[PDB]
Amino acid sequence: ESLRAATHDVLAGLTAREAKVLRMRFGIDMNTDYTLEEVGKQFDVTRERIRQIEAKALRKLRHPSRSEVLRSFLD
DNA sequence: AGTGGTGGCGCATTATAGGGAGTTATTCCGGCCTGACAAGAGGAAATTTAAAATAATTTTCTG
């Protein structure tokens, strides 16, 4: 429960459509996950750019002080 | 000394195991979609240096 709350607020901390991308790529707060091509169709930009978005978001969250609170969930 | 009895084999009967056929259900084999890399283009923020002004140093002039 704590993890879902924290991940939701930290996603809220990031940009809008990137956040929606990351929610859709996974099952975060949503049902079955669609593969990259289908989400790209969802934005109508359907290609490697979507994984470019994924990698850029991951890179952007790599920076500490935001994820360390979530780092705690590792053990 | 002869008629039957004993053993072994044969004939008929009896018993047991393996193989084939089936059938089901687990398991291997292959194509196709995701996923990762390498490249390319156009446009915009950041940084650096050069030029131009206010506030102080130095020199000169005035009282």
CATH code for the domain in which residue A17 is found: 1.10.10.10
- The set of residues, in sequence order, having a beta carbon less than 8 Å from that of A35 and lying 6+ positions away, is none
And the tokens for A18? 């990137």
Residue range of the domain that includes A29: 1-72
The experimental technique used to determine this model is cryo-EM
CA–CA dist A27, A34 (Å, integer)? 9
On strand B, nucleotides with any atom < 7 Å from a protein CB are 33-39
Number of domains in chain A: 1
Separation in Å, CA A37 to CA A16, A43, A47, A48, A54 = 20, 10, 6, 9, 13
d(CA A15, C1' B56) / Å: 51
CA–CA dist A45, A10 (Å, integer)? 25
d(CA A35, C1' B28) / Å: 28
